XYZ file of C-alpha atoms in Angstrom:
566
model
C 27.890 2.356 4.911
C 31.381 0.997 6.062
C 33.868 -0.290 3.947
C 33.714 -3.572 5.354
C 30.003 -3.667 4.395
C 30.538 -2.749 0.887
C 32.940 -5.524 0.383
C 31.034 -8.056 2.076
C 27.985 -6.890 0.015
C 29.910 -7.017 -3.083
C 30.751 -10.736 -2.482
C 27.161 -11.473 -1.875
C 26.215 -9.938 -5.302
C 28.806 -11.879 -7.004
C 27.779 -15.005 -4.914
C 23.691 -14.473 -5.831
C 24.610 -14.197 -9.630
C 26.335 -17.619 -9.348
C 23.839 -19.153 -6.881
C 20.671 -17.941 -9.311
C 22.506 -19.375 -12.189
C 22.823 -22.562 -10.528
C 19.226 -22.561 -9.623
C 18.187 -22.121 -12.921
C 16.554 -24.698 -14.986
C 15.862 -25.640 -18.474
C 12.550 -25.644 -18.506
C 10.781 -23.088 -20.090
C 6.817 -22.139 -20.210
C 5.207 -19.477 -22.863
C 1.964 -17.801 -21.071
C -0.713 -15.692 -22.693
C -1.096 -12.333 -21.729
C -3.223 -9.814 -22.983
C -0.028 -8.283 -24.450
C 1.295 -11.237 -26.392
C 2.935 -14.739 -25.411
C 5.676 -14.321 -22.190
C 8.432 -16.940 -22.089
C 8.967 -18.195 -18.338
C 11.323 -20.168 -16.713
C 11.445 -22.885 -13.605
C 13.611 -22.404 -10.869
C 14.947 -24.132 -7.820
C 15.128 -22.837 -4.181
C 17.568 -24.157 -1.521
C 15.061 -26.015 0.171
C 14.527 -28.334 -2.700
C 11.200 -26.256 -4.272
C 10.148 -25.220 -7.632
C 8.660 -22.619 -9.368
C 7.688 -21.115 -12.430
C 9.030 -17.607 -13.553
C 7.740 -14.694 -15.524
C 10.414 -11.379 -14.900
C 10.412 -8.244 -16.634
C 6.623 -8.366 -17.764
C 5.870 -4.706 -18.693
C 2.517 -3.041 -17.540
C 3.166 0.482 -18.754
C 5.488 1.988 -21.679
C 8.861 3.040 -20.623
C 8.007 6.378 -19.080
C 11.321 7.905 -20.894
C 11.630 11.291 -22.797
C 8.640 12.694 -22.741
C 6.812 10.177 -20.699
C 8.744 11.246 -17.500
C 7.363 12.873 -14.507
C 4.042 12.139 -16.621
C 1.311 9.419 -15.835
C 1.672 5.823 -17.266
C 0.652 4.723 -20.576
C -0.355 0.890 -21.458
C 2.875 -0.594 -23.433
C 2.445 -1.673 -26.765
C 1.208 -5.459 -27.890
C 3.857 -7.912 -29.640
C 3.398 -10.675 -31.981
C 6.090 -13.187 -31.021
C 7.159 -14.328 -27.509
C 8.881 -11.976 -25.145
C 11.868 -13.007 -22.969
C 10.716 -13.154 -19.417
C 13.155 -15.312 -18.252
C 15.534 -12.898 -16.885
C 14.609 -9.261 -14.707
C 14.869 -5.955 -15.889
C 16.717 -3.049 -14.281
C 15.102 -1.034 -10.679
C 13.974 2.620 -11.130
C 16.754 5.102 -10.940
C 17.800 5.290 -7.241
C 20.387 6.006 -4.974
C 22.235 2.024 -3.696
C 22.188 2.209 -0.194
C 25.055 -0.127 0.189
C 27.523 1.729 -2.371
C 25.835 5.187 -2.467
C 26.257 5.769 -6.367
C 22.947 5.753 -7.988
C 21.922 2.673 -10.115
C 18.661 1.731 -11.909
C 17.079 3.235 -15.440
C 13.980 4.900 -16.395
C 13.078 1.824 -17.992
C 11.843 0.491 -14.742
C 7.990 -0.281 -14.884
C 7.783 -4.001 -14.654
C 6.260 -7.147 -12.723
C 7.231 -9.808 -11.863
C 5.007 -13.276 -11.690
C 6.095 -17.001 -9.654
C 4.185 -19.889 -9.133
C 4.471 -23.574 -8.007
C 2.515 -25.038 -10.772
C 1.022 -22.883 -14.273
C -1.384 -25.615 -14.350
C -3.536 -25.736 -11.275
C -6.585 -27.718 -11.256
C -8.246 -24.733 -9.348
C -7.608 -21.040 -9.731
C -5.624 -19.368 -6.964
C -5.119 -16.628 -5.007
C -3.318 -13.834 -6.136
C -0.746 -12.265 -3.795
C 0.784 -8.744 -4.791
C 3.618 -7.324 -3.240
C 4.251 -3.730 -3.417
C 7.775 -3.092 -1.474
C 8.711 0.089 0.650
C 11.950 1.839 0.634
C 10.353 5.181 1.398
C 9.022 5.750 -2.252
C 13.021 6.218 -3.281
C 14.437 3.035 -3.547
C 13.491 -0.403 -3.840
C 13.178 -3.028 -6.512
C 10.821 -6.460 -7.072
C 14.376 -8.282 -7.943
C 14.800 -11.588 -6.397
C 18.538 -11.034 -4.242
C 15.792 -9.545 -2.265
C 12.640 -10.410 -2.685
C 12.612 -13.674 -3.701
C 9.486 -15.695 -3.664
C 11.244 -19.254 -2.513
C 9.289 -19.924 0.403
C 5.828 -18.083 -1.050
C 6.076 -20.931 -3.771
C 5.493 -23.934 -0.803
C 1.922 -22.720 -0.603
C -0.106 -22.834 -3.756
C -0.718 -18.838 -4.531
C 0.302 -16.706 -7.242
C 2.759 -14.476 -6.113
C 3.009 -11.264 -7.616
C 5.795 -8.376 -6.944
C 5.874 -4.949 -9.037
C 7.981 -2.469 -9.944
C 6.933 1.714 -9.779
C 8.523 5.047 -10.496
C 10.506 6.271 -7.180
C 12.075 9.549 -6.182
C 11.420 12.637 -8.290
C 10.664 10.485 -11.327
C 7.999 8.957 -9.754
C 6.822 12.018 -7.288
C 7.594 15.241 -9.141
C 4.578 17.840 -8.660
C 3.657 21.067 -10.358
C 0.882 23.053 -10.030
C 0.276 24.777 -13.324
C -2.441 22.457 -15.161
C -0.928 23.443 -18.062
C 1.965 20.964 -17.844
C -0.192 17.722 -17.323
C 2.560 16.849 -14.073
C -0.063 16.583 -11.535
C 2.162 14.283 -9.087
C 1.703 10.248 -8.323
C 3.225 9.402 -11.286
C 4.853 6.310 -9.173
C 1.088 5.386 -7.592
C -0.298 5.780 -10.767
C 2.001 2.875 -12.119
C 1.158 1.012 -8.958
C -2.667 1.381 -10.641
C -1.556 0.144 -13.839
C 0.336 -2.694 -12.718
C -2.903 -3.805 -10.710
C -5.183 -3.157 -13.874
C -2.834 -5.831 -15.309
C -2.921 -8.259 -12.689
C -6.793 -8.154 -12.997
C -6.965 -8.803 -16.362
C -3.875 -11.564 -16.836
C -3.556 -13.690 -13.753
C -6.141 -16.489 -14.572
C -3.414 -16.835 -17.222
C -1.076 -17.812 -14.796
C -3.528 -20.066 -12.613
C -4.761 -17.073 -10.393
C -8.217 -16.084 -9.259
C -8.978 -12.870 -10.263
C -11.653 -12.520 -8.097
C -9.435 -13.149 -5.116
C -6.483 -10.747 -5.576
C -4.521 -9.246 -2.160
C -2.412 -6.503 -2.530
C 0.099 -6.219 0.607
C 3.339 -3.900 1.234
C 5.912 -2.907 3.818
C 6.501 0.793 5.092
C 5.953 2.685 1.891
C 4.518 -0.265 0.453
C 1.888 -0.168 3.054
C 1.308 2.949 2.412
C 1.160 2.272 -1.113
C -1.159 -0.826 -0.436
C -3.638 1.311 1.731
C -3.142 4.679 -1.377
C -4.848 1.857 -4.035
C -7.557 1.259 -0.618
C -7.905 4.847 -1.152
C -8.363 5.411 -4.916
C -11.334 5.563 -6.958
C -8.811 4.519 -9.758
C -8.722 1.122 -8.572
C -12.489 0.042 -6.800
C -13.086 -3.553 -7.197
C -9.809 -4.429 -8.418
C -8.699 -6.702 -5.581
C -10.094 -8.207 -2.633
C -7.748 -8.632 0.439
C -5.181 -5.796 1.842
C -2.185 -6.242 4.577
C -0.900 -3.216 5.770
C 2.497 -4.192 7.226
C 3.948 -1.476 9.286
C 2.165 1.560 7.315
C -0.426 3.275 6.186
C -1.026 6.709 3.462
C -1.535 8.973 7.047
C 1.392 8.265 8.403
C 3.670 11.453 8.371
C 5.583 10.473 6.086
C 3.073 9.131 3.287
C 2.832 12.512 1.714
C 3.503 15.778 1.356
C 3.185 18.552 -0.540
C 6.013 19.208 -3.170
C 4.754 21.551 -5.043
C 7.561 23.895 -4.175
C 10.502 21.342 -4.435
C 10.639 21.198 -8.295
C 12.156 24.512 -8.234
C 14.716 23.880 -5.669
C 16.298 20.299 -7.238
C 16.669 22.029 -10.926
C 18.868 24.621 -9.214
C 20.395 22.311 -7.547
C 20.593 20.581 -10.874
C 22.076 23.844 -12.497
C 19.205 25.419 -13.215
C 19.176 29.211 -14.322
C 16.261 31.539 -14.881
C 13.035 31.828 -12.566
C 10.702 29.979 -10.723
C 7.772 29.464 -12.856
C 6.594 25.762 -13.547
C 7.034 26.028 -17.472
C 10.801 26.494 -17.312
C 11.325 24.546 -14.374
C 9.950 21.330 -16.365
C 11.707 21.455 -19.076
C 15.037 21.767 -17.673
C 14.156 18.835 -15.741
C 12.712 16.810 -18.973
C 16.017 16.614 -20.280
C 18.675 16.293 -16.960
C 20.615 12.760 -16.805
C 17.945 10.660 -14.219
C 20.871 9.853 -11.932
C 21.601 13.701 -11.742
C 18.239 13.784 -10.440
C 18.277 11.251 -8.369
C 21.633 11.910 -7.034
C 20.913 15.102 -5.783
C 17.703 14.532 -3.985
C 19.023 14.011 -0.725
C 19.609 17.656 -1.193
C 16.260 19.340 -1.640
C 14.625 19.345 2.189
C 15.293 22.780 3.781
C 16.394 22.717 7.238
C 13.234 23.509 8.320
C 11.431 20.766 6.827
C 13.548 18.469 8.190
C 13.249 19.996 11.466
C 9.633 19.504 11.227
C 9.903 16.157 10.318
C 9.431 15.932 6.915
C 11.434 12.747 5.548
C 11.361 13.129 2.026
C 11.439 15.659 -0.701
C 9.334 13.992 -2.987
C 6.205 11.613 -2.378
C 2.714 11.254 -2.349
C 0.916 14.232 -2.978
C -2.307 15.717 -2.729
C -2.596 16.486 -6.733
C -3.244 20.271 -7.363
C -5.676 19.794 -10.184
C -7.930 16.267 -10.923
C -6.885 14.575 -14.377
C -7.974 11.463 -15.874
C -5.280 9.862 -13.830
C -5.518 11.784 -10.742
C -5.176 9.015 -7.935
C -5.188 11.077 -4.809
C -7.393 14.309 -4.825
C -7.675 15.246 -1.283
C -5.586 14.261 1.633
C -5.395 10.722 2.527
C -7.907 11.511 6.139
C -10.619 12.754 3.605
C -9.937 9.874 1.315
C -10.615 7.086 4.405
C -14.211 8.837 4.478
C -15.234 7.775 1.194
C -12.826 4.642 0.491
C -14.170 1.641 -1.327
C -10.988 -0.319 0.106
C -12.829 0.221 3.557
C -15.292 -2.813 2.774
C -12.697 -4.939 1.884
C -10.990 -7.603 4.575
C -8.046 -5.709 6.030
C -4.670 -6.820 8.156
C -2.693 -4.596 9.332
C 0.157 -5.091 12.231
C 3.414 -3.691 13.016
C 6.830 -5.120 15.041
C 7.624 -4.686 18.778
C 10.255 -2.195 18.317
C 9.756 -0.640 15.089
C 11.437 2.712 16.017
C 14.453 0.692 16.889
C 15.315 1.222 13.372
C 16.759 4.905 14.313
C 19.599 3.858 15.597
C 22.077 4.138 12.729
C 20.470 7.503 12.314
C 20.927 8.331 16.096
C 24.533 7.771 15.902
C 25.206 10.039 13.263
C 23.398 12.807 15.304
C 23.151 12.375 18.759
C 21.651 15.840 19.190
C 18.300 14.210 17.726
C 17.726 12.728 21.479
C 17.446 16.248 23.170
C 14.491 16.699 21.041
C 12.518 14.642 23.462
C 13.458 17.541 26.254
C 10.239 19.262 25.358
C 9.147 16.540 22.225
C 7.884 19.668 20.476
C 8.852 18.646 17.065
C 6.969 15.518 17.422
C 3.788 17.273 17.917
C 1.663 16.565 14.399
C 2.575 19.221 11.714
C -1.341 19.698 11.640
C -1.042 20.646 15.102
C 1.639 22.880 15.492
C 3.152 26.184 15.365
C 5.046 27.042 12.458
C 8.362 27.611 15.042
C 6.935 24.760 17.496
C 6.872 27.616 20.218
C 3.099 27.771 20.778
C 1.923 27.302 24.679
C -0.399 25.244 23.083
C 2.929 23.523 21.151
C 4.600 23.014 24.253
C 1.573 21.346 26.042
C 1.293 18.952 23.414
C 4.254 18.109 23.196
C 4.633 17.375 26.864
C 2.216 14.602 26.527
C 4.467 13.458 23.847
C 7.023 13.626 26.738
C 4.908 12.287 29.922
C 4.320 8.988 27.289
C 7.932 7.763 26.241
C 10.605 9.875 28.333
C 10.811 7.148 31.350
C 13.519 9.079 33.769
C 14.884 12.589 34.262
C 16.422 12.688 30.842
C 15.365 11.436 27.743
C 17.112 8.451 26.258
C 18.050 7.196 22.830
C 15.531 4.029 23.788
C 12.779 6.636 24.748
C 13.581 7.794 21.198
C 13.168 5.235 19.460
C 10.387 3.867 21.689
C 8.835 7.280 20.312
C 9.627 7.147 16.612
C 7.359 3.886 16.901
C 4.479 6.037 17.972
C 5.041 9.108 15.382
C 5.818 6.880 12.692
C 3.659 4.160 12.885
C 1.171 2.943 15.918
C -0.489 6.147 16.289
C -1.009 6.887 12.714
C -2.919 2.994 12.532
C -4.767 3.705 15.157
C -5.904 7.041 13.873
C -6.651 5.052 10.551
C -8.583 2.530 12.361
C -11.038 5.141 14.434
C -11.930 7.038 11.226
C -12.433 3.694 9.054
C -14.885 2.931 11.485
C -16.902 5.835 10.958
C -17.254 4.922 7.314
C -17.342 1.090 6.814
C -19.684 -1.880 5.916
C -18.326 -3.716 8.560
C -15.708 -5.900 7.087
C -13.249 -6.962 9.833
C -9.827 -5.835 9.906
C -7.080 -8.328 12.295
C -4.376 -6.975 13.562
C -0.714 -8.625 14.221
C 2.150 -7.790 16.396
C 5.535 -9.239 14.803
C 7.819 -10.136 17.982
C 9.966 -12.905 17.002
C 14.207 -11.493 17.246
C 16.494 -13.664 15.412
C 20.055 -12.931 14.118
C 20.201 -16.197 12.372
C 18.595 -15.396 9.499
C 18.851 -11.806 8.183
C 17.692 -9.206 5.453
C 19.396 -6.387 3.750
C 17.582 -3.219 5.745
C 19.915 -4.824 8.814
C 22.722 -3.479 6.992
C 21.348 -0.115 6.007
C 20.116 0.390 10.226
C 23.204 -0.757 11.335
C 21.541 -3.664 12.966
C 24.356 -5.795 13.768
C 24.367 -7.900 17.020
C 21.412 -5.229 18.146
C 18.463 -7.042 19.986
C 14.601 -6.352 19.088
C 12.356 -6.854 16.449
C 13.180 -3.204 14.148
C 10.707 -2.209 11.472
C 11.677 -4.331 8.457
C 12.702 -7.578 10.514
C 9.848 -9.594 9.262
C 10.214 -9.677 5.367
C 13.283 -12.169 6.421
C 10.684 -14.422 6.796
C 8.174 -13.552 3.930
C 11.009 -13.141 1.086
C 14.280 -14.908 0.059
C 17.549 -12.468 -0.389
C 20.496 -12.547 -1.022
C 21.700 -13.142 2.562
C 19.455 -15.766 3.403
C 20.339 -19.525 3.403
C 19.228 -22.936 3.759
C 17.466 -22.932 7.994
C 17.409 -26.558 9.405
C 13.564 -27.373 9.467
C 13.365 -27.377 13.296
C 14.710 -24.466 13.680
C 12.737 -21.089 15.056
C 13.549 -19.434 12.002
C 11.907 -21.641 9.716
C 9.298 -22.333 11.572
C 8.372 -18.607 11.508
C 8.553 -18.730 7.630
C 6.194 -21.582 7.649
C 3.927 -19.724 9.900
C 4.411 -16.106 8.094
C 3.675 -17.496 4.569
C 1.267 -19.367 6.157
C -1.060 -16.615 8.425
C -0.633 -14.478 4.888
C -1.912 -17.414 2.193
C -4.522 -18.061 4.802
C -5.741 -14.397 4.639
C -5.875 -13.981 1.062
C -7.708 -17.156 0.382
C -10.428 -16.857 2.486
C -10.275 -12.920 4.309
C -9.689 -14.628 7.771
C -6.560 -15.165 9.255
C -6.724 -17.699 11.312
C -6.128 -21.774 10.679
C -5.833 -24.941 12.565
C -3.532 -26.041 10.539
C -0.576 -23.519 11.112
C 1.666 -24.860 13.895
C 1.332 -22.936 17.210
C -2.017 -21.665 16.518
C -4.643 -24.297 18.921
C -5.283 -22.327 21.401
C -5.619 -18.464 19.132
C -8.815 -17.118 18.898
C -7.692 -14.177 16.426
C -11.039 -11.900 16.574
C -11.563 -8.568 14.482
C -11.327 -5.004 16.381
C -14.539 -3.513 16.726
C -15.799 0.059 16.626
C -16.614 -0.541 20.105
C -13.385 -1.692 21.628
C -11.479 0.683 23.973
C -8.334 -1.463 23.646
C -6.909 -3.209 20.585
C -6.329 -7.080 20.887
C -3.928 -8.283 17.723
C -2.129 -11.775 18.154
C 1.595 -11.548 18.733
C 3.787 -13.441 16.691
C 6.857 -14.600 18.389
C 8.340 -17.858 19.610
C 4.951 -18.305 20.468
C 1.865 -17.100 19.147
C -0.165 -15.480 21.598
C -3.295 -13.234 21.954
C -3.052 -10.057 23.694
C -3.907 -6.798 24.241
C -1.759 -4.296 22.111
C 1.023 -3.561 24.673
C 1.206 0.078 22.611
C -2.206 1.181 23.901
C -2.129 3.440 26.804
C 0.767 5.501 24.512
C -1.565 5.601 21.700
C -4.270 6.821 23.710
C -1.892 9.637 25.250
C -1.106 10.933 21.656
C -4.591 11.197 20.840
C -5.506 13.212 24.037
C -3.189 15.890 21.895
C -6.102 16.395 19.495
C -8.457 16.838 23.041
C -9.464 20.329 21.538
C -9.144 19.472 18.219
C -10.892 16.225 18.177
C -12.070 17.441 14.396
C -8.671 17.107 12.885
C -8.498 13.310 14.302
């Protein structure tokens, strides 16, 4: 990220710790919690809100020493109040902005806001689990602040997990009780919490809604998944993501070895050894030199990070994902639950920033053989059948005689997210109750208003709605300020926060009373429907037939003879 990025970043940090002073109040609350009494604080938003807030609420013991790589352990009780009135640190990561690594191991927190502690009925419960690819991310409020969640009267609800290697470190030897999901098993904890404490805060806890973004979809969909967590919550939105997209999981088994020697590791690759050179590296050592691990190969094939979601080698106590995610969708309890899912109208056009770096990545699309699903093909991509695939791949986004970088990222919207929802939606159907599931298109382009991820994509004066574009509009950061209340861009908060309370109250999207909405008739997809129908959201909000179908329908003729891996 450019110099001129970092500096203008750097004045933004100094100008949030000075604007969330400011916004600060003197008003203080002390909640119960299960743990012992929490000390909250009020604070202001620019538009003239309030809200009470609980930060750094822990929901596991700080996984240090020997905690780490291991699953989460409920934190001990205090007699006395805890400080909640300020946030605690992000798990150990790599800053995107400055590229040194930042963050502790003393990172498994939540964070809890609401308009009024005092409701004269219990409330929903919103829960925000944020993406950043399972390697970075954070639930502090310079970017995701929950200023405009507070106008409607929910709980809001934003948690903190293990990322990276910390979080995602796999081994297979039972012996060594490092199974993998370390960082969805704190997502587990975190929710056992929320059950069990929000009527505390004013919340219903028998109308909780977990929703995420991109890995926090994914994450959102894993505790779908999980036996760990059946009956915990009530509601899930599944914005842009989902635990089979590509790169949800993998199998890491093998990468342990590779980051200690990066690390400075000598001896051999047996599990034992590898561990406990690991157990006692510096975390940002670890961290740092992630970026590493991925062969050439891997990344070839696609694979986007080292460590992740895994399918975990033995079953513990813990153990939150014990077969792939496909097989999981077969027996899910989160199936019978009201579902949303959606994605934006150009989320591939993300890519660019990575495009630029390597324009090479565009003559992939000659033959579109490394696009083909892993589970599909050839271990060199060389296959007839390989080829034949992935000129289907080809026939579906390359539009002339040579492939652009638009067709690329027109196709990086497929691989990455459309197809794998509509392969999640075909094999939920086959093992559902019946609840419905609504689907949304986000389509509404501003440069007005902007978040952080612009930065990181390069998405400066670039038109289209990239993967990412819409948590301007759920989430207050650092970049954000005051919008007139006429304007587009407010308007689409209103309607955002407003679609998303409406869910989570009642399971159905759709109200009246959201501006722009008379004339939708926002039905559920059925089993029977050849074509998806999901209401657009831009300057208008319209209901149409997903515009991404006939490509969809192209990838799946891939799996024509192999309809059994679909």
């Amino acid at each position: 990220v450019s110099l001129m990025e970092k500096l203008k970043w750097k004045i933004k940090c100094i100008e949030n710790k000075f604007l969330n002073y400011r916004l600060t109040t003197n008003e203080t609350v002390v909640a119960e919690t299960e743990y012992g009494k929490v000390k909250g604080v009020k604070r202001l938003t620019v538009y003239d809100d309030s809200y009470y807030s609980f930060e750094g609420i822990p929901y596991a013991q700080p996984p240090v020493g020997e905690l780490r790589f291991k699953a989460p352990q409920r934190p001990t009780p205090w007699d006395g109040v805890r400080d909640c009135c300020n946030h605690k640190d992000k798990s150990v990561q790599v800053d995107f902005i400055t590229g040194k690594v930042c963050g502790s191991e003393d990172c498994l927190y939540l964070s809890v806001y609401t308009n009024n502690l005092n409701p004269e009925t219990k409330r929903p419960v919103l829960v925000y689990i944020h993406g950043g690819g399972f390697i970075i991310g954070e639930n502090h409020r310079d970017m995701y602040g929950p200023d405009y969640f507070i106008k409607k009267d929910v709980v809001l609800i934003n948690i903190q997990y293990r990322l990276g290697a910390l979080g995602f470190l796999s081994l297979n030897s039972e012996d060594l009780n490092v199974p993998g999901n370390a960082g969805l098993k704190d997502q587990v904890m975190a929710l056992r919490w929320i059950k069990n404490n929000c009527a505390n805060f004013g919340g219903n806890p028998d109308n909780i809604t977990v929703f995420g973004e991109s890995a926090g979809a994914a994450s959102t969909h894993y505790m779908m998944l999980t036996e760990q967590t059946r009956g915990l919550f009530h509601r899930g939105i599944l914005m842009s993501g989902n635990a089979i997209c590509p790169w949800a999981n993998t199998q890491c088994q093998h990468r342990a070895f590779t980051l200690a020697k990066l690390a400075g590791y000598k001896g051999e690759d047996n599990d034992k050894d590898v561990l406990e050179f690991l157990m006692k590296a510096k975390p940002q050592d670890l961290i740092k030199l992630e970026e590493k691990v991925l062969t050439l190969e891997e990344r070839t094939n696609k694979v986007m990070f080292p460590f992740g979601p895994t399918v975990e080698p033995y079953q513990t106590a813990d153990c939150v994902l014990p077969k792939h995610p496909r097989e999981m969708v077969k027996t899910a309890w989160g199936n019978s639950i009201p579902t949303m899912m959606g994605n934006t109208s150009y989320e591939g056009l993300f890519f660019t920033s990575i495009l630029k770096q390597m324009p090479l990545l565009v003559k992939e699309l000659e033959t579109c053989v490394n696009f083909v699903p892993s589970e599909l093909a050839d271990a060199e991509r060389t296959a007839p059948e390989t080829l034949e695939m992935g000129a289907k791949i080809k026939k579906a986004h390359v539009t002339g005689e040579t492939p652009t970088a638009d067709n690329f990222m027109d196709l990086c919207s497929h691989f990455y997210f459309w197809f794998p929802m509509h392969r999640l939606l075909q094999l939920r159907f086959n093992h559902t109750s019946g609840t419905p599931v609504y689907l949304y298109r986000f389509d509404f382009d501003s440069e007005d208003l902007i978040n952080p991820y612009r930065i990181m994509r390069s998405g400066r004066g670039v038109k289209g709605v990239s993967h990412t574009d819409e948590l301007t509009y759920f989430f207050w950061n650092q970049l954000a300020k005051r919008m007139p209340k006429e304007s587009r861009e407010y308007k689409t908060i209103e309607r955002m926060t407003g679609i998303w309370t409406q869910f989570a109250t009642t399971g159905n999207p759709y109200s009246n009373e959201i501006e722009g909405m008379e004339n939708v008739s926002w039905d559920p997809i059925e089993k029977s429907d050849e074509v998806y129908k999901c209401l657009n959201i831009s300057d208008e909000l319209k209901m149409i037939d997903v515009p991404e179908m006939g490509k969809i329908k192209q990838w799946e003729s891939m799996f024509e003879k192999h309809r059994d891996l679909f």
